[PDB]
Coordinates of N, CA and C in Angstrom, one line a residue:
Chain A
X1 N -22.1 -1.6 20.3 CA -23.1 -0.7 20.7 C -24.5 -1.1 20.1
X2 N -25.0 -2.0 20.4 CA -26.5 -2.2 20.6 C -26.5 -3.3 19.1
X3 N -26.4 -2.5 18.2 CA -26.9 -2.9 16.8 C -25.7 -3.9 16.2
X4 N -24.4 -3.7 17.2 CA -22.6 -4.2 16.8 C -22.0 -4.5 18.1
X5 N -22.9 -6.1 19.0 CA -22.4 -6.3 20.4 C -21.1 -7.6 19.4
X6 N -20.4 -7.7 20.0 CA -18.6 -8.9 19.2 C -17.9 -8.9 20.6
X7 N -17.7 -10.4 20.2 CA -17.2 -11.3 19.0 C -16.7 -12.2 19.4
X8 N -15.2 -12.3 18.8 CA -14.0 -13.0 18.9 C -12.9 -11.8 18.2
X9 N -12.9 -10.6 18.7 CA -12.0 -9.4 17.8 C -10.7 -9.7 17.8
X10 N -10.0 -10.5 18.7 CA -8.7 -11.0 18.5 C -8.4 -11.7 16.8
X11 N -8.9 -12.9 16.8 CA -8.5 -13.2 15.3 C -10.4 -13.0 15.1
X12 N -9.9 -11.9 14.2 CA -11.0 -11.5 12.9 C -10.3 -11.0 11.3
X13 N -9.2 -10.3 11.6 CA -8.3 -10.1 10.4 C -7.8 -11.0 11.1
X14 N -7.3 -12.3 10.3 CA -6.4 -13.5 11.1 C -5.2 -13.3 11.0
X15 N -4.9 -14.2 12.0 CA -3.2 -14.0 12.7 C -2.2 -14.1 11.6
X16 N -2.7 -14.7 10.7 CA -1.6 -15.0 9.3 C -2.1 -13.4 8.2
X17 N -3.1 -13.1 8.6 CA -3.1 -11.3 8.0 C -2.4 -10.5 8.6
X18 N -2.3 -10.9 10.2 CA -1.9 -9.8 11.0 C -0.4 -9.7 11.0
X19 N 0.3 -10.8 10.4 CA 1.7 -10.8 10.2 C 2.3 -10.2 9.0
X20 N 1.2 -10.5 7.9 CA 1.1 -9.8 6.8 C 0.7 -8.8 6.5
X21 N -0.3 -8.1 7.1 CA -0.3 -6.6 7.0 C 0.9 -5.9 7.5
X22 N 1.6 -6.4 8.5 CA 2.9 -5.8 9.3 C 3.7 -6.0 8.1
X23 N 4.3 -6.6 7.5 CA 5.7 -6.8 6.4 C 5.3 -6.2 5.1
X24 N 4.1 -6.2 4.8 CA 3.7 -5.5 3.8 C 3.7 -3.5 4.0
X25 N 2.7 -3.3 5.0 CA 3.2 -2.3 5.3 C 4.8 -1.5 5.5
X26 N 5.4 -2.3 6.3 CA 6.8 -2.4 6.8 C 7.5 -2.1 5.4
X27 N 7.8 -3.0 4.2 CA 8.3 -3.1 3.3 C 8.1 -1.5 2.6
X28 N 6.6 -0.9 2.6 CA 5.9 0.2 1.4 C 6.5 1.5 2.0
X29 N 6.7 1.0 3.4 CA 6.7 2.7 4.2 C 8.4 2.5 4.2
X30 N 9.2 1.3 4.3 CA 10.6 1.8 4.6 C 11.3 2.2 2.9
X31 N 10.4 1.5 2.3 CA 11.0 2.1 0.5 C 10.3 3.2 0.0
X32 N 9.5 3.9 1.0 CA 8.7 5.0 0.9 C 9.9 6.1 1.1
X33 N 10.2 6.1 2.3 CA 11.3 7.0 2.8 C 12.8 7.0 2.9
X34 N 13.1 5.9 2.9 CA 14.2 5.6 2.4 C 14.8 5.7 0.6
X35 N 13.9 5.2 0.0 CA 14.3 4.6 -1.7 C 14.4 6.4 -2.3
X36 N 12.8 7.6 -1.7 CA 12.8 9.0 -2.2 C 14.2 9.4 -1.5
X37 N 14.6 9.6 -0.3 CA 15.7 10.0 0.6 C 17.2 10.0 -0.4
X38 N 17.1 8.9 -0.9 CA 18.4 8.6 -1.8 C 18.1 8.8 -3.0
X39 N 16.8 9.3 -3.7 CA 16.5 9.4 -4.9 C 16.6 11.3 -5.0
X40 N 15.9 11.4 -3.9 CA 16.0 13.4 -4.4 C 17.1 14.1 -3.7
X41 N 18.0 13.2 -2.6 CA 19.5 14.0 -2.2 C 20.4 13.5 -3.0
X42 N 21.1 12.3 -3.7 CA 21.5 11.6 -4.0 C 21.8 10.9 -5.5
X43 N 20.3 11.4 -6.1 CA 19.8 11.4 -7.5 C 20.0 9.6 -8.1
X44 N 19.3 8.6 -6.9 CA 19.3 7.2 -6.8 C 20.3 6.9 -7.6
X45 N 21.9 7.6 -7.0 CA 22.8 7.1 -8.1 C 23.5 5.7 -7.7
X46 N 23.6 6.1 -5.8 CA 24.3 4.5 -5.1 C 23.1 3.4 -5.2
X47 N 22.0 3.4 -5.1 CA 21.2 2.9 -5.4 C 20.7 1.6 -6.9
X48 N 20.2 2.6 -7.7 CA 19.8 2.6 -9.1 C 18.9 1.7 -9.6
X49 N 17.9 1.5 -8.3 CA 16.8 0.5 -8.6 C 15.3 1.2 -9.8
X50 N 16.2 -0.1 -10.8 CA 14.8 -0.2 -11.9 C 14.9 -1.9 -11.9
X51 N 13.3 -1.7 -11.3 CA 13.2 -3.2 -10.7 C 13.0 -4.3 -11.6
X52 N 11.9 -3.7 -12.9 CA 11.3 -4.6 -14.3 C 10.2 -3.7 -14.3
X53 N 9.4 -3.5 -13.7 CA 8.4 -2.4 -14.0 C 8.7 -1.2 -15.0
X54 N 9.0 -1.2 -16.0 CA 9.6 -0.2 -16.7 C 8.5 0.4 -17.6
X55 N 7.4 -0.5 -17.6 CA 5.8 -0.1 -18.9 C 5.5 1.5 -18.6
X56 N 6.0 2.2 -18.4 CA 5.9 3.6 -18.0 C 5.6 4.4 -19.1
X57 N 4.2 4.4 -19.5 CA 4.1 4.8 -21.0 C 2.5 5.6 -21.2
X58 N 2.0 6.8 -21.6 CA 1.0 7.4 -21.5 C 0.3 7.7 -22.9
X59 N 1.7 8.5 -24.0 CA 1.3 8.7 -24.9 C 2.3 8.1 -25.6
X60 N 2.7 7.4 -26.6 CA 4.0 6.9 -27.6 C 3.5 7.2 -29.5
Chain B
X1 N -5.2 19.4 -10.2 CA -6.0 18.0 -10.2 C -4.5 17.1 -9.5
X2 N -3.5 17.0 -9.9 CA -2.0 16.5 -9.5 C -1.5 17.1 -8.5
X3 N -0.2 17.0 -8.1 CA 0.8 17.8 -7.6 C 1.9 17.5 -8.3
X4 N 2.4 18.8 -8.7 CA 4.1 18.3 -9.3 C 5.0 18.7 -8.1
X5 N 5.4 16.9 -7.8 CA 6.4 17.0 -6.4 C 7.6 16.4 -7.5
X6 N 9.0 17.2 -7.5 CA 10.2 17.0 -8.2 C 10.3 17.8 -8.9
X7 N 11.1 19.1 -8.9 CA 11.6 20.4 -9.6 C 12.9 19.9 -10.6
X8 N 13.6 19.5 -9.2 CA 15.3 19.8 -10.1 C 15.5 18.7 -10.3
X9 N 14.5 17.4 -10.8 CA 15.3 15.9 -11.1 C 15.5 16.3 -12.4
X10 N 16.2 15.0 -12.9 CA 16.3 15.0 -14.4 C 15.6 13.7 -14.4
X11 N 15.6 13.6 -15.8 CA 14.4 12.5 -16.7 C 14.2 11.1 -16.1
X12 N 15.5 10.7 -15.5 CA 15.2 8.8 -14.6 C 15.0 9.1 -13.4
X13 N 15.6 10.2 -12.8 CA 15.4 10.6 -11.3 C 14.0 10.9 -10.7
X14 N 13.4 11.7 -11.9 CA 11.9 12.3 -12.0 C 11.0 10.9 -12.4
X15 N 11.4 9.9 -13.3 CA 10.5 8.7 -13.5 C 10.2 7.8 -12.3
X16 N 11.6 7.1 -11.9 CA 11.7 6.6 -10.4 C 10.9 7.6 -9.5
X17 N 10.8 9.1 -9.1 CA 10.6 9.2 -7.9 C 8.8 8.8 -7.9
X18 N 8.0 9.6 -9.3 CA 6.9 9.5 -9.7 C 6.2 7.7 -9.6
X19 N 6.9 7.2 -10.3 CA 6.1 5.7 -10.6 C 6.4 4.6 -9.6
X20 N 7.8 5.1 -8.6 CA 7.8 4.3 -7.6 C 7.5 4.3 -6.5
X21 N 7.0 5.7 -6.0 CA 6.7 5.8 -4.9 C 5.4 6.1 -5.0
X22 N 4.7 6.3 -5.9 CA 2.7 6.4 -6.6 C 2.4 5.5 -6.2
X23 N 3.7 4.1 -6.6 CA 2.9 3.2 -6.8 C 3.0 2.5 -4.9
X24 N 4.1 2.7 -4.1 CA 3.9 2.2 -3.0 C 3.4 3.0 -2.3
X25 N 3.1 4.1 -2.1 CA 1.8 5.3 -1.4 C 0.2 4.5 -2.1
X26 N 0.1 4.0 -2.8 CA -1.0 3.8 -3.1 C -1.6 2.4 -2.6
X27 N -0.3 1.3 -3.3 CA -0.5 -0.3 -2.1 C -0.3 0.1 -1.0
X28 N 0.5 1.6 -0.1 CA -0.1 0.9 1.3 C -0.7 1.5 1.8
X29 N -1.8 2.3 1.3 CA -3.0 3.0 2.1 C -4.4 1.6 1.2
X30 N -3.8 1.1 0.1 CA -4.7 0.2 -0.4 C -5.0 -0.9 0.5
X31 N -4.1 -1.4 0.8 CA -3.4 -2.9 1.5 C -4.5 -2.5 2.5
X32 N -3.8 -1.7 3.5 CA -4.3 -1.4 4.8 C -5.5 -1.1 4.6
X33 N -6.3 -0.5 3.7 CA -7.8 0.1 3.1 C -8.2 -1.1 3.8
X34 N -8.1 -2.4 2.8 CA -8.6 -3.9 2.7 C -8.7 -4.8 3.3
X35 N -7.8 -4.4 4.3 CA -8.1 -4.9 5.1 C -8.5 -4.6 6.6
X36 N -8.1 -3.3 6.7 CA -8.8 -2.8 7.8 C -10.6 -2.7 7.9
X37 N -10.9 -2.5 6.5 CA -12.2 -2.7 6.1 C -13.4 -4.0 6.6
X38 N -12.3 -4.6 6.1 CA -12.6 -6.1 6.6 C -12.4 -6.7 7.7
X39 N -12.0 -6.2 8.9 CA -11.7 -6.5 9.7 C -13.1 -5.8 10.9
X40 N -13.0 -4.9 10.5 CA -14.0 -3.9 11.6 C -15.5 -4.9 11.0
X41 N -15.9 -5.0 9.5 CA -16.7 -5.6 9.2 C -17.0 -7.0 10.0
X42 N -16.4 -7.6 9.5 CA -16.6 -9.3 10.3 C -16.8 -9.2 11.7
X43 N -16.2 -8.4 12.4 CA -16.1 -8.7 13.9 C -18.0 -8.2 14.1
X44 N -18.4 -7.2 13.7 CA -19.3 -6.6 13.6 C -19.8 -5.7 12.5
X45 N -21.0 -6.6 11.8 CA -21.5 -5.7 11.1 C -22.0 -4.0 11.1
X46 N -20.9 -3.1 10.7 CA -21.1 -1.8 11.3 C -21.5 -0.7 10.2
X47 N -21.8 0.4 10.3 CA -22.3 1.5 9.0 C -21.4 2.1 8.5
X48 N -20.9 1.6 7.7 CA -19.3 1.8 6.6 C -19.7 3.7 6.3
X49 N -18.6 4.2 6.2 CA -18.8 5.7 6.3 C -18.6 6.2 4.5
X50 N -16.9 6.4 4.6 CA -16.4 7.2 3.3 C -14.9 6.2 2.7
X51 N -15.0 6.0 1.5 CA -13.8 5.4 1.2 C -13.4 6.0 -0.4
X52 N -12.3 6.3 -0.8 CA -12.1 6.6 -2.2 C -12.1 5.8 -3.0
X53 N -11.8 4.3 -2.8 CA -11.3 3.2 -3.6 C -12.2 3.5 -4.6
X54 N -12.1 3.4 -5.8 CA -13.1 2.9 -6.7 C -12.8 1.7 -8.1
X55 N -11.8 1.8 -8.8 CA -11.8 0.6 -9.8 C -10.3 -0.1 -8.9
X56 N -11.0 -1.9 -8.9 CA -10.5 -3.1 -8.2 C -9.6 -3.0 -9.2
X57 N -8.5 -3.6 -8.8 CA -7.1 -4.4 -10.0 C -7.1 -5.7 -8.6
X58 N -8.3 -6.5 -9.1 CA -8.8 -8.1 -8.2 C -7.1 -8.1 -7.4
X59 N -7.5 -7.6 -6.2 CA -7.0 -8.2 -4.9 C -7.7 -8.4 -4.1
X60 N -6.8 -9.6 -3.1 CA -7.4 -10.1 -2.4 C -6.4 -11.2 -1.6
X61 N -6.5 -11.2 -0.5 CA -5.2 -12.2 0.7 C -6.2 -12.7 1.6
X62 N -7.3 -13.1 1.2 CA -8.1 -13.8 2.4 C -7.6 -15.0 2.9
X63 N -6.3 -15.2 4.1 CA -6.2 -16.7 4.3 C -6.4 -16.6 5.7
X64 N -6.3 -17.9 6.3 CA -6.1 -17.9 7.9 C -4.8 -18.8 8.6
X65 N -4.9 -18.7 9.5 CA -3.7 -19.1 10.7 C -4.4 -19.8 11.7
X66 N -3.6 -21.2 12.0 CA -4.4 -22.2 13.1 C -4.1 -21.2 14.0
X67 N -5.4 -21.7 15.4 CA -5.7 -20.6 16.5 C -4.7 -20.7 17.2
X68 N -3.8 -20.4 17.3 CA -2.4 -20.3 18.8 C -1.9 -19.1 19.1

């Protein structure tokens, strides 16, 4: 619109982002609802992922 | 200022639900932030509105893909 005439909008986030935003996303949102799903019915007992991130620390 | 989401967990149930899902609610409205940002930008320089982001932890995935 006048001040923003484009482009090439096809690849501008490139095609190797666009594969990557999808699996990254994909990955956050299915351990989003699935990983809580088994964590607050289930109490992540069949599960039991503690991945290494364990530094969970505020005041010691 | 929070929300306390988790009543009836107990102490590992309440840790996991807190620090692992903070942390992926946050990379992926981040992710997508970053690049959706960047995307609308390059094609066309446009008048960026409202964003929360404020202190970086340096990311960054700028690569590309041959044209096909």
């Amino acid at each position: 619109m006048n001040l923003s005439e484009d482009c090439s909008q096809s690849d501008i986030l490139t095609t190797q982002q666009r594969a990557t935003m999808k699996y990254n996303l994909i990955k956050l949102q299915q351990e989003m609802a699935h990983l809580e799903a088994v964590l607050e019915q289930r109490g992540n007992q069949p599960s039991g992922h503690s991945p290494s991130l364990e530094h969970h620390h505020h005041h010691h | 200022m929070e929300e306390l989401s988790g009543k009836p967990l107990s102490y590992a149930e309440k840790e996991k639900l807190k620090e692992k899902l903070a942390f992926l609610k946050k990379e992926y409205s981040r992710t997508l932030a970053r690049l959706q940002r960047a995307k609308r930008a390059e094609k066309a320089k446009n008048s960026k509105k409202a964003i929360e982001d404020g202190v970086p932890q340096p990311e960054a995935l700028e690569h590309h893909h041959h044209h096909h």
